[PDB]
Design a protein around this ligand. Structure first.
Ligand code: F05
Length: 330
């Protein structure tokens, strides 16, 4: 089998991407944040604290003839931005772009933190990291991809995120029309539960390439590109007026600036992030100070190849016995 779904930025800044997901019988379609940085499928639901729902579409298990309460199971998760959610668990039929999994763990939110409440466009998350990170207790549950894998034509999924435009998530095949040149594959460590790999270096604008190993994770659920402070300092030093701001929380730059591109290495191959991808707009409405899309990972404890980097590429999440990651230009 295969599936193919369109993913859409939630706002004009590409702050995140939502993909329609069908849950239950009859289908309830919710717009979920496909997150290769986490491993829980959780949704706003009829069980969510009334006051914490503000425009989201909810999953109502009582309306689904195929939903079953997973007895005694609970979940609780905290993400890297300090956000969190928790609740109970159902199993139900879940379909993504024509690909169907029966008996998928659908984690129903009883509580969500304010950032979720405040974002009416995201109805929940669909995790695509390794199931070893899944938070369900006392019986850990598998991800949609893990459950579908044996059924797929090939045990892969691909992420093709757009810059201020829709993109695609494919399951089970590689669309050879969706990228240019060849796909370069690179080793993955699953030891922390992530799609963790090692970039071979970087360049700033028309700068010479710096060969240096940068370990980090391919994370579609993170908006920005988080890299070592040395790398980030080298980038922003090429932008007149750019500065690290403690008050704002990162590098800012004049909104009048033209940003240089940023290149990262995949083996001997190179992926170029155009400068405009690194502009995340005024720090506050009306400000002429803009927030940077490349930020230091110092204090995060891990480098993150978030959407700013991934949207520059066609990315293969290869779920074979020994997983690997592939990158192509597009
Ligand atoms: N993977 C993720 N990075 C940041 C974040 C916030 C909320 C949910 C998922 C993520």
């Amino acid at each position: 089998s295969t599936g193919s779904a369109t993913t859409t930025p939630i706002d004009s800044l590409d702050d995140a991407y939502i993909t329609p997901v069908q849950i239950g019988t009859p289908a309830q379609t919710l717009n979920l944040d496909f997150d290769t940085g986490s491993s829980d499928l959780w949704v706003f639901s009829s069980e969510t604290t009334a006051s914490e729902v503000d425009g989201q579409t909810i999953y109502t298990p009582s309306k689904s003839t195929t939903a079953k309460l997973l007895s005694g199971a609970t979940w609780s998760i905290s993400y890297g931005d300090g956000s969190s959610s928790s609740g109970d668990v159902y199993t139900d039929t879940v379909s993504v772009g024509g690909l169907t999994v029966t008996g998928q763990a659908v984690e129903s939110a009883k509580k969500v933190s304010s950032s979720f409440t405040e974002d009416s466009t995201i109805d929940g998350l669909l995790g695509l990291a390794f199931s070893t990170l899944n938070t369900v207790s006392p019986t850990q549950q598998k991800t949609f991809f893990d459950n579908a894998k044996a059924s797929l034509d090939s045990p892969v999924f691909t992420a093709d995120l757009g810059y201020h435009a829709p993109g695609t998530y494919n399951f089970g095949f590689i669309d050879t029309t969706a990228y240019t040149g060849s796909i370069t594959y690179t080793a993955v460590s699953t030891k922390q539960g992530f799609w963790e790999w090692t970039s071979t270096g970087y360049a700033v604008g028309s700068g010479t390439f710096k060969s240096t190993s940068i370990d980090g994770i391919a994370d579609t659920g993170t908006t920005l590109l988080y890299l070592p402070a040395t790398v980030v300092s080298a980038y922003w030093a090429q932008v007149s007026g750019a500065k690290s701001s403690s008050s704002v929380g990162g590098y800012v730059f004049p909104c009048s600036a033209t940003l240089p591109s940023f290149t990262f290495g995949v083996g001997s191959a190179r992926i170029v992030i155009p400068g405009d991808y690194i502009d995340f707009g005024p720090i506050s409405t009306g400000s002429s100070s803009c927030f940077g899309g490349i930020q230091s990972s110092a204090g995060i404890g891990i480098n993150i190849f978030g959407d700013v980097a991934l949207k520059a590429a066609f990315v293969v999440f290869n779920g074979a016995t020994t997983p690997t990651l592939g990158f192509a230009s597009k």
